[PDB]
Write a protein that binds this ligand. Structure first.
Ligand SMILES: Nc1ncnc2c1ncn2[C@@H]1O[C@H](COP(=O)(O)OP(=O)(O)O)[C@@H](O)[C@H]1O
Ligand SMILES: Nc1ncnc2c1ncn2[C@@H]1O[C@H](COP(=O)(O)OP(=O)(O)O)[C@@H](O)[C@H]1O
Ligand SMILES: Cc1ncc(COP(=O)(O)O)c(C=O)c1O
Ligand SMILES: Cc1ncc(COP(=O)(O)O)c(C=O)c1O
Lengths: 390, 412, 390, 412
């Protein structure tokens, strides 16, 4: 079938992981685990579809308000998340974060707030403060089994007269928490009661490992809302910029479309991104299932090795991602010492945790979306660098 | 007022096979929150629901049409179905629905559940053809409904495809019962029984089974072969060959060749004219088609097997099967494209005569007769105001805008 | 060598010209001349380069602050416009209009003005008013030979205390006027004197027919300025969204880069757009020269046919574009009658002139960037529809 | 103060060949606004410009270095070249440059042109190595200069590549004279003459011609083969084979193998130490290298043919050819990486001794000696304030950062 147990070079292709030391490191001869793409080649169906769109030759203006694009999106939702969508509400955007920022500019003024769950994805802070909107964070709490938002503190935050938007990352990043039906119910009710619109970033929707399925925002969605996503992380094609979303209250959908086409002139899509998304959603299910199996095997290998090297970790593989958010606090080790040991004694770049702010102290973020050959070296390096500084 | 044809369980199962395979599946429907039956049109799922419902009395029924896509009318009809299921028990919410003194469907449903909690017996509510709803507000409110309904209630939704009801939530908590397309198809034994009960010549069972699979057990396909053989158009296998794997477009020209051309031209005109009506009874028939033995005409049509179905046992209201109905509409918009506006006007005035201004408005705007709406308004301003058909009013005039200006000068 | 005398189908490829009647027409069975791309297939060098980037397979994150991208841009400028650039001032953007809008948001407040020359490109009004900045137009005047901006009125406009930006389209659109050295000198001096920054949109820089060549903004540029362009119109690849520019006063370049990467999350480029631009600029010169010859032949054929059918037109081919901005005012004909005759009696869609506002009354805009087979039908249709309504 | 080595025309006339065609091309340089000479380093274009300048007296010269990339120093040196070309005629702008009472380079140049218009004789200004300028303000001001200069002035710019001077504007109006890379290369006859005048063994023209083309007529290539044959390293064709089509990297290791290893180690140390100096005279040599017969050492080096060139006929100032100079710098940063800071300090204090605080600052920040800058400051606060070297002061502090923090405390 498919083979993921092979290394593609990725040298000399301008890629931010293998071709650029700064600022991931300084030695430039490291094994990189810092950036959150996957080392795999995308699905052969997407490649063949692009190859066939290339033989056409002409690359004139194209339209995204298609009929095959929307049909493919609806088919993906129905057969992979058992959710039905009104395909006349799907909108296009260059990137997920662009749509997030546009909606923030639309559903709030300057100086008002945007709730997020921390440790949050990096770019969320950039998008929120770049528009001069204040971040209002709510910390997930790790305990016995996974991470748990405390609805008391969340409701206390939402009650503020300034909080207008809730930027929900589902599945969460980097913890990998998949929200349960009950959590989504309560969050939606609280948001509706306190007049807070919701933006649901769901770009990780496909990489779920738990036995409970991820639940879409639209099923619990009320009034104005938005569900933004892309097949980039799922199929490893972020180099073909393109994202889609679902905005409701057609007045808001229309305001967004006006801003996208008129004010910022971004309406012309990338015809190859649409070709990739169509081919992926209509024929990329076997490839994606094989990849899911492989990524779960990698995560469980990490868990075995680590929990066997230091019996007092008790690390469980995350609910849904291919990014291990390792908690090293039960080892009483200092992170700067660990980072120096990793860089110099071992030559392995592993993104530290304090870059996520204060909630990240004591963690590391290990990209597991790579062939096992590389993962073995990475985890051996981490184990050695821990022992050598313990 | 409420069109009775929309609030009654279809009947007239003169020759319907009954299969436990599906009735047994539905037997436990009280333990769940929602019974979702989905398949392309012509499955016979609606016939099964009517069968399953013939053995209950505390069960409301609600057939949908595109006009239901407005929210106030939707609420009115839904509360009507609830009353029929509980025998007038929910009076307060009924008056709130008739007087439109509710902020939003969710508040109306909260009030309904206050009253619903008191009822202690199993309750059932059937909503037919949910795919015709495209209003997101209605979807939202129906999700709220399913989330907050009392446990003795069970909702039954018949649809063409997966609806936007928050189904994944229910599937997670095992509160959902589904009967998909595959289960609804006729098996070999059922096809044998069907061709036995309906045909003049008996068919060997294997031959019926061969007809059964090559058409995928699709019910309306079987009905087509049956009625074709009734007139002895073909031997069965030839018609089945004509029908095997037929798509929407080829179904149309098949209908054109085999069902329209094998009747007399008078009945053809009757069908093409009557098609534009949503629900038909004797009065509307005799008004639009001019033929006076209207009830005679309808009952004889139903005898001929042309996809006309009653909507109550009293034999009062009738409806076409949506496939055949839409086909007849599209064919009439050509064979009689010239005679459309006067026919729409006759239908509209006949509707108003029976006391239903809303269908009159629909058919009038279909005709494009401004002064027709003018007369509808000065003829029922009393009921339009006392029953507050205000969104009806705004859409109608807004949908002759220079003539509509009237609403401009009314706006200030 | 190359062959442009052939018709590519372009049916079923989502293209806004051949697949979408609305709102270019209503009959949907027309010969379309409305949208400003070219019916040609792009250069075989670009196609081969994309094809070779596809066989790699991996489409992870990429970087535009490359060394081959910048080298190719500098080589293009030096060998095609005899202008040297500091390649460390080149910035990237998703589209030209996006960069225009970002700079407008940066170099002015709300309610201030943006000078443009009318008849202006359509999207300029959208970008300027979408940001709630008032347009302050200056009308070119057609006379004996081409169009002439009157520096008296221009200076009168610039003197306003509200005018802050000048959006210079060079070569102009749709008139096709190429600014002379003297014009550029005087405009730059006037702008500098009255404290107006300049944004030079130069996306047509390569399609120049006159004997005097195109002079970039940078040679006359001072203080804060910007020169935005792309190889999209030149090589007919707008379906691979990507544009570049040169911003000066490194504070402004940095503010723009911050807005592009941080606030709007658009920094990840389209690796295939960069591949296309590199291949085009390093190897696409023979193809471009052949295409230049062909387009000039098409424009002169139009001129011959028209000026021979109505001797009182006196139409000269434009200075630089492949869009004929035909002036039909010397025929005293009504444009709505002409448009109805073109749609119905002839089945040829030709963009009317009044869509450019009031300055466009009496003109039509005929896309000449097509094989001659189609151009013959188009011009025959226009001649017939004129005669049949004369 | 102004380093004289930067304001004087190089004057070496030993084995140089006279190229008449290029001089003819330059003969009409007064009719134009700009004479642009561009080629990779080692072309000999600078030698041609000096040859073209040996026959004029009213011609200023200005050699550039990376330190010129600051604007005030640039203006000072440029006005100095103008004075040398007009013999002190422009006094007002000179005092404005020395007192830095100008808003911007454009206003200074406007004042200069006021004075420039009065002069009635042809004027010439040579700016060497313009590729070292990367300041956009300087580019802008030089474009203004070229646009507004009086017609009797002609600007000559020597550069590695096309500069940002608004050249297309001039090319349109035919006010530009170019001498590109191709014209500057030595032809066959010129190569014959060159090898004749410089070698101890006569070279057949065809063999010289083969050596001429296979190295593309590149001047410094020829000089390399010549000096190699002077020590009788090789027969000429073998060295040419070693040099044919050589890139930057292979030029480096060639220099390492053939020019550095074929001298005595004392001279090697002398070269490697002296390389870090921009312009060298006897005092700086005897200070840094410790060898006391400094002028003797420099003149004997220049005799040996190691790319040392005078900067005036008085034999006072010397400079390395930028290729060989940068090579020696990169090699010294390894062979003597340990001895760098004390050498930088000696150079800095020797510069300050001669009255030039700016080069002292440069070499000190190269050494990384904070208290060295402290002493430079308390030793020349009088000249730093009276000659207003304030931007020098601001930059230097960031590169004694705690002292810079004290400067930040001074900031308020
Ligand atoms: N049990 C049955 N026995 C015989 N015929 C049936 C049976 N069920 C359905 N049919 C035929 O198939 C058609 C089914 O229509 P149906 O699918 O119930 O409409 P809907 O679109 O509302 O679901 C009917 O016309 C009926 O004649
Ligand atoms: N006319 C000439 N005769 C002999 N040798 C020359 C002549 N011109 C240049 N050269 C040699 O070539 C080199 C040219 O250096 P040059 O290119 O003038 O430096 P720059 O980088 O300033 O242009 C010098 O070292 C010189 O020895
Ligand atoms: C949580 C999250 N949101 C959004 C994005 C999209 O970012 P990008 O456009 O760089 O792929 C990613 C990556 C992501 O992980
Ligand atoms: C004058 C002008 N500016 C900008 C653009 C870029 O627009 P687009 O991104 O749609 O290609 C074009 C086209 C154009 O003709």
């Amino acid at each position: 079938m498919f083979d993921f147990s092979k290394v593609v070079d990725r040298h000399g292709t301008w890629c931010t992981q293998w071709d650029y030391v700064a600022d991931r490191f300084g030695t430039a001869d490291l094994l990189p685990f810092t950036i959150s793409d996957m080392d795999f080649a995308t699905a052969p169906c997407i490649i063949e579809a692009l190859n066939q769109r290339l033989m056409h030759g002409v690359f004139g203006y194209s339209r995204w308000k298609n009929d095959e694009f929307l049909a493919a999106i609806a088919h993906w939702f129905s057969t992979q998340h058992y959710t039905a969508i009104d395909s006349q509400t799907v909108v296009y955007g260059p990137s997920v974060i662009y749509m997030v920022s546009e909606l923030i500019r639309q559903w709030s003024e300057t100086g008002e707030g945007v709730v997020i769950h921390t440790p949050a994805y990096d770019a969320f802070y950039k998008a929120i403060e770049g528009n001069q909107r204040t971040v209002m964070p709510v910390a997930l709490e790790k305990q016995a089994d996974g991470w748990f938002c405390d609805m008391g503190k969340l409701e206390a935050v939402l009650a503020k007269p300034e909080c207008k938007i809730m930027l929900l990352c589902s599945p969460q990043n980097p913890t990998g928490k998949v929200w349960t039906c009950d959590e989504l119910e309560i969050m939606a009710d609280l948001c509706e009661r306190h007049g807070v619109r919701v933006i649901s970033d769901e770009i990780h929707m496909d990489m779920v490992w738990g036995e409970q399925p991820h639940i879409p925002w639209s099923n619990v969605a009320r009034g104005d809302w938005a569900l933004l996503t892309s097949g980039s992380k799922s199929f490893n094609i972020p180099a073909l910029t393109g994202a889609y979303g679902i905005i409701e209250n057609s007045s808001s959908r229309d305001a967004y479309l006006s801003a996208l086409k008129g004010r910022d002139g971004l309406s012309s899509p990338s015809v190859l991104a649409l070709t990739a998304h169509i081919a992926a959603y209509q024929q990329g299910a076997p490839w994606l299932d094989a990849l899911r199996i492989y990524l779960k095997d990698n995560l469980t290998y990490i868990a075995d090795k680590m929990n066997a090297a230091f019996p007092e970790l008790n690390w469980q593989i995350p609910q849904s991602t291919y990014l291990a958010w390792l908690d090293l606090r039960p080892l009483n080790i200092d992170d700067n010492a660990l980072q120096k040991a990793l860089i110099e004694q071992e030559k392995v770049a592993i993104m530290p945790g304090y870059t996520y702010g204060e909630e990240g102290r004591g963690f590391v973020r290990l990209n597991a979306g790579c062939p096992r050959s590389k993962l073995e070296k990475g985890v051996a390096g981490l184990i050695n660098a821990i022992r050598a500084v313990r | 007022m409420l069109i009775p044809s929309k609030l009654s369980r279809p009947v007239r199962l003169d020759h319907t096979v009954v299969r436990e395979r599906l009735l047994a599946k539905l037997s436990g429907a009280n333990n769940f929150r929602l019974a979702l039956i989905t398949s392309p049109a012509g499955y016979g799922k609606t016939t099964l629901i009517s069968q399953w419902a013939a053995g209950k009395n505390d069960i409301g029924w609600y057939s949908l049409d595109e006009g239901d896509n407005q929210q106030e009318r939707f609420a009115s009809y839904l509360i009507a179905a609830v009353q029929q299921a509980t025998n007038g028990h929910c009076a307060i919410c009924e008056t709130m629905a008739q007087k439109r003194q509710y902020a939003s469907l969710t508040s109306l449903f909260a009030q309904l559940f206050i009253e619903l909690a008191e009822w202690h017996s199993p309750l059932y509510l059937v909503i037919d053809d949910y795919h015709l709803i495209t209003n997101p507000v209605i979807h939202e409110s129906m999700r709220f409904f399913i989330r907050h309904q009392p446990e003795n209630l069970t909702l039954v939704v018949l649809s063409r495809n997966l609806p936007q009801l928050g189904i994944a939530n229910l599937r997670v908590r095992d509160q959902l019962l589904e009967i998909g397309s595959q289960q609804l198809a006729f098996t070999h034994q059922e096809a044998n029984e069907f061709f036995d009960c309906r045909l003049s010549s008996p068919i060997e069972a294997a031959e019926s089974s061969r007809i059964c699979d090559d058409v995928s057990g699709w019910a309306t396909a079987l009905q087509l072969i049956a009625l074709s053989a009734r007139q002895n158009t073909h031997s069965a296998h030839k018609s089945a060959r004509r029908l095997a794997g037929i798509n929407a477009s080829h179904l149309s020209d098949y209908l054109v060749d085999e069902v329209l051309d094998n009747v007399d031209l008078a009945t053809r005109h009757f069908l093409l004219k009557s098609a534009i009506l949503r629900s038909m009874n004797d009065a509307l028939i005799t008004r639009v088609t001019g033929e006076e033995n209207g009830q005679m005409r309808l009952e004889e049509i139903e005898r001929q097997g042309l996809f006309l179905q009653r909507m109550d046992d009293t034999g009062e209201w009738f409806c076409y099967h949506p496939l055949f109905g839409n086909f007849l509409r599209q064919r009439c918009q050509w064979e009689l494209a010239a005679e459309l506006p006067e026919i729409h006007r006759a239908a509209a005035e006949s509707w108003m005569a029976q006391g239903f201004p809303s269908e009159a408005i629909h058919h009038a705007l279909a005709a494009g007769d401004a002064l027709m709406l003018r007369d509808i308004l000065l003829n029922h301003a009393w009921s339009l105001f006392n029953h507050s058909e205000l969104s009806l009013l705004e859409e109608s005039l807004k949908a002759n805008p220079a003539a509509a200006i009237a609403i401009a000068i009314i706006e200030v």
